[PDB]
Amino acid sequence: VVNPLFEKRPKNFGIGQDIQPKRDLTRFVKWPRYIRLQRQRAILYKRLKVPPAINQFTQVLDRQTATQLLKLAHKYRPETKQEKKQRLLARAEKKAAKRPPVLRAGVNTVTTLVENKKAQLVVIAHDVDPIELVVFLPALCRKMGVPYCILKGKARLGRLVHRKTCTTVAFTQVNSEDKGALAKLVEAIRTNYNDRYDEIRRHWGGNVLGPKSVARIAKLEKAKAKELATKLG
Amino acid sequence: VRPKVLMRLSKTKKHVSRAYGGSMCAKCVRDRIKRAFLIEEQKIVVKVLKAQAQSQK
């Protein structure tokens, strides 16, 4: 029932033969300078030796912990501009006839709170740049005995406070209906960050060669171990 | 004629009623028809021998 005129006309893509197919060349593209620069900065961080003070920021909350931490924090977001106008208007109505707990944003506000021991939990974004703004904070929070955690995204802390970005937030008080939720977080966070601090600050990062180099090293070793194995047979 | 004069000449004046006409001489078109056919035939022959030795292998 098939039409006999139809037939296979396969292409032979060997060297010579037919022109090559338009296969994916994403790996061999000549990218703009700025793309090369930001990618090469990612390999340098892996390639070089990253001191523990900076490397600690690679250790971050697993997704399950961050989602719970961000769900609890979402109950304490600072009021927006639109709704702060409303509160003032109502205050006028209340006048014509207590401060709820709230998060604290910013490294300047949070640092002062941590020194005063007025913070119960400090959350630090893992990708602050320049890192100097926060590179000291983990060591400070441990000194004052404030539980702290490192979370993925200075922009996820941005969405909390209705701003593009935030370097760090802090719980100072919570409603009684939430004290249990904070208590569980603090206990889980503290064992990961404050208690391991002795090991966090002695743990360098990076210092990993590239896959081509590693494979070259392995293939050389795999020529000796096999040579060793056939030494006895 | 000069190259820009070719714009105002009909097509019959600028070519020949034959494949490649006006671009390749008849003598070399004869050689290409044979060369194309004869090399293509050689491919079939080698293909059968190559397939045969594969069968014999």
Partner: protein, 118 residues
């Protein structure tokens, strides 16, 4: 999805047309090469008379910035005549002279009387 060329090229992006808040000029500039400006005066020399009588041609001194199209449109509108062709030379003193040949049904000697040339 995939790049089948090794070359990166700047992607094409939207380009909006200009929408000024105010016009940079309050009003458009007045046309300073109107019909009256183009035609200065007629030439009345001996060689000009010969053109009128023998070539059906009027001889005008025109603005040096005028072109043959504008001169033709000026001569027609000013004197309600028809033009066959306009020849122009720039004189050694810097003035532009127009040899305006009128249509065959227009008698240049008659038209010259209307213009007051003769």
């Amino acid at each position: 999805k995939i790049r089948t060329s090794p070359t990166f090229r700047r992607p094409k992006t939207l380009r909006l047309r200009r929408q000024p808040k105010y016009p940079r000029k309050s009003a458009p500039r007045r046309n300073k090469l109107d019909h009256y400006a183009i035609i200065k005066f007629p030439l009345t020399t001996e060689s000009a008379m010969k053109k009128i009588e023998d070539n059906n041609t009027l001889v005008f001194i025109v603005d040096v910035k005028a072109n043959k199209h504008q001169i033709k449109q000026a001569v027609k509108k000013l004197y309600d005549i028809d033009v066959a062709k306009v020849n122009t030379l720039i004189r050694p003193d810097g003035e532009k002279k127009a040899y305006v040949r009128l249509a065959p049904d227009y008698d240049a000697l008659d038209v010259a009387n209307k213009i007051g040339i003769i």
